[PDB]
Design a protein around this ligand. Structure first.
Ligand SMILES: CCCOc1cc2c(cc1\C(C)=C/C=C/C(C)=C/C(=O)O)C(C)(C)CCC2(C)C
Ligand SMILES: CC1=C(/C=C/C(C)=C/C=C/C(C)=C/C(=O)O)C(C)(C)CCC1
Lengths: 239, 218, 11
C-alpha cells in the first residue's frame, strides 16, 4: 500500500524544500571547468585549494541554513545545535558532493557550477580520500535517490542523539524518529517492488561515517600542507 | 514467507549455542577471551541459515572481514547489566578504570556509551542481536567475494526477518528496526579503531619476545 | 569560540 500521511507528507516536503533551496541539483545547474592541474596527481595545488576552500565555506553556511529549517532543530539548545553541526558537517558535505557526480566524465560539480575531474579533486585537497569519495558516489547511483531522500538522509545524519558532549540526547532521538519514519515509507512508496531499499539506503550511513572519519584526519594533514591557515569557518567547524 | 527464508528462531539458536559458561593486565585478558570466541565463531557461522551454502572462499572472506565487529557486538550485549565495564567470555570482568590504566580508555568508553549503553536503553534482545551480527556477517562489500550478489541477498533476507520480528514483538515501536540498524555505524567505527590498536600484531614478520638478540650472541 | 557559527545560528 504505502499511503502517505499528511503529517509525514508535510515533513517530507519541508526537508526537500530545505535541501533544494540550500543545494541546487546537478541538472538544474550550468557547469564550467578549468585547465590547470588536470594532468597528473599532486600533493596539493594552491590555486585549486583556494577556489575549493571558498566553495566549502559557502556550502557549510548553506548546511547551517539547511539545518535551521529542520523541525525542532531550532528549538534545541545552542550548544547542542553546534555539537550536531560540527559532528555531521563532513557527513553532509560528502553526501551532497556525491550527488553531483557524473559517471561518464568522472567529475564532481560544485554549487558555483565548477566541475572538477578525479585528478583535480585530488589536487584541490581531497587527496587520499579522492578514491574513497568517488567510489562512494558510484555506490549511490544504484539507489536512484531524489532530492527528498538525499535530504532525509542528511537530516538523519545531522539529528543524531549518539553524539558525545550533548546535553539533551534523548530529545535529539525523538526528533530523529519522524525523519526515519518518513524515509521508510517514502523510499518504498517509490520502489514498491523492492522494500529492501530502505535498510540498504540507511546502511549507506555506516559507510559514510567511515569516509567522514577519514575526512577529519585529512583536515589535519592539510592544515600542515597548506601555506596559510584554514578559513575561520572551516576551523570553527572541524576543529 | 519472510521469516521462513531466514528464520529468527534458527539465528537465536546460533547465538545461544555459542554462549560460554584477574591476574594479568586488562588487554591480555581481552585477547584471552577473544581467542576463545574465535574458536567458536566458525561454528556460529555454520548455524546461520544459508551460510554454509556459500563458496568456501566467500565464507573465509566474510569471517576474515567481520570477526572483530561480530565479537565486539557479542560481549557488548553480554555486558548489558554491568556498570561501567564489560563481561568477558572467560567469565572475567574488565572495569572502566582498569581499561584506562592499560591505555585503552578512549576506545573502551566508546564501547560503553555507544554500544553497551545503547543496547541497554532500548532493551535489545538476543534475537535482534543475532540478526544484527548476521547482517554484519553477510557483508557484500568484502574484498575478493566471488559472488557479492548472493551475499547481498542473504543480508536482505535478514533485513526482512528482523523487521518482521520487530513489528511482531514491538508493535508500539514502529521505528525499532531502524533504531537497531543505526547501531551498526558505531560498531563499524569502533571495530576499525580496535584494529588500529593491534596493527603491529597483524603485520608481524621480525622476531618477537626478543629471541632475536638472545641467539645473536650465543 | 564559534563566533561565526553563533552569528549564523542567531539569525
Ligand atoms: C584480538 C586482539 C585484539 O582484540 C580486541 C582488543 C580490544 C577490544 C576488542 C578486541 C576484539 C577484536 C575482540 C574482543 C573480544 C572479546 C573480549 C570477546 C569476549 O570476551 O566474549 C576492545 C574491547 C574493543 C577495546 C580494547 C582492545 C583494544 C584491547
Ligand atoms: C571541507 C574540507 C574537506 C572536505 C570537502 C567536502 C566534502 C566539501 C564539499 C563541498 C561542496 C559540496 C561545495 C559545493 O556544493 O559547492 C577536506 C576533507 C578536503 C578537508 C579540507 C576541508
Amino acid at each position: 500500500s504505502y499511503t502517505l500521511t499528511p503529517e509525514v507528507g508535510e515533513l517530507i516536503e519541508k526537508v526537500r524544500k530545505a535541501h533544494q533551496e540550500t543545494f541546487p541539483a546537478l541538472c538544474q545547474l550550468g557547469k564550467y571547468t578549468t585547465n590547470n592541474s588536470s594532468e597528473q596527481r599532486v600533493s596539493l595545488d594552491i590555486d585549486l585549494w583556494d577556489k575549493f576552500s571558498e566553495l566549502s565555506t559557502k556550502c557549510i553556511i548553506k548546511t547551517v541554513e539547511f539545518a535551521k529549517q529542520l523541525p525542532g532543530f531550532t528549538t534545541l539548545t545552542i550548544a547542542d545545535q553546534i555539537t550536531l553541526l560540527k559532528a555531521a558537517c563532513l557527513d553532509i558535505l560528502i553526501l551532497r558532493i556525491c550527488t553531483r557526480y557524473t559517471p561518464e566524465q568522472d567529475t564532481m560539480t560544485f554549487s558555483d557550477g565548477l566541475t572538477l575531474n578525479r585528478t583535480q579533486m585530488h589536487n584541490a585537497g581531497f587527496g587520499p580520500l579522492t578514491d574513497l569519495v568517488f567510489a562512494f558516489a558510484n555506490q549511490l547511483l544504484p539507489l536512484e535517490m531524489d532530492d527528498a531522500e538525499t535530504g532525509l538522509l542528511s537530516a538523519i545524519c545531522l539529528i543524531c542523539g549518539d553524539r558525545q558532549d550533548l546535553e539533551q540526547p534523548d530529545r535529539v532521538d525523538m526528533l530523529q524518529e519522524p525523519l526515519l519514519e518518513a524515509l521508510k515509507v517514502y523510499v518504498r512508496k517509490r520502489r514498491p517492488s523492492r522494500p529492501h531499499m530502505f535498510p540498504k539506503m540507511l546502511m549507506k550511513i555506516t559507510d559514510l561515517r567511515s569516509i567522514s572519519a577519514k575526512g577529519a584526519e585529512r583536515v589535519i594533514t592539510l592544515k600542515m600542507e597548506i601555506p596559510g591557515s584554514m578559513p575561520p569557518l572551516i576551523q570553527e567547524m572541524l576543529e | 514467507s519472510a521469516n521462513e527464508d531466514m528464520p529468527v528462531e534458527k539465528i537465536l539458536e546460533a547465538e545461544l549455542a555459542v554462549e560460554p559458561k584477574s591476574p594479568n593486565d586488562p588487554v591480555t585478558n581481552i585477547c584471552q577471551a577473544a581467542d576463545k570466541q574465535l574458536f567458536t565463531l566458525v561454528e556460529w557461522a555454520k548455524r546461520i541459515p544459508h551460510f554454509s551454502e556459500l563458496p568456501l572462499d566467500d565464507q573465509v572472506i566474510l569471517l576474515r572481514a567481520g570477526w572483530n565487529e561480530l565479537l565486539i557486538a557479542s560481549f557488548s550485549h553480554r555486558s548489558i547489566a554491568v556498570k561501567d565495564g564489560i563481561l568477558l567470555a572467560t567469565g572475567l570482568h574488565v572495569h572502566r578504570n582498569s581499561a584506562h590504566s592499560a591505555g585503552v580508555g578512549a576506545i573502551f568508553d566508546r564501547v560503553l556509551t555507544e554500544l553497551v549503553s545503547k543496547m541497554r536503553d532500548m532493551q535489545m534482545d538476543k534475537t535482534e542481536l543475532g540478526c544484527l551480527r548476521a547482517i554484519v556477517l553477510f557483508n557484500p562489500d568484502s574484498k575478493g567475494l566471488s559472488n557479492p550478489a548472493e551475499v547481498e541477498a542473504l543480508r536482505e533476507k535478514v533485513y526482512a526477518s528482523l523487521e518482521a520480528y520487530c513489528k511482531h514483538k514491538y508493535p508500539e515501536q514502529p521505528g525499532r528496526f531502524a533504531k537497531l540498524l543505526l547501531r551498526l555505524p558505531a560498531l563499524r567505527s569502533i571495530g576499525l579503531k580496535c584494529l588500529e590498536h593491534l596493527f603491529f600484531f597483524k603485520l608481524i614478520g621480525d622476531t618477537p619476545i626478543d629471541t632475536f638478540l638472545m641467539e645473536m650472541l650465543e | 569560540k564559534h563566533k561565526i557559527l553563533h552569528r549564523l545560528l542567531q539569525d
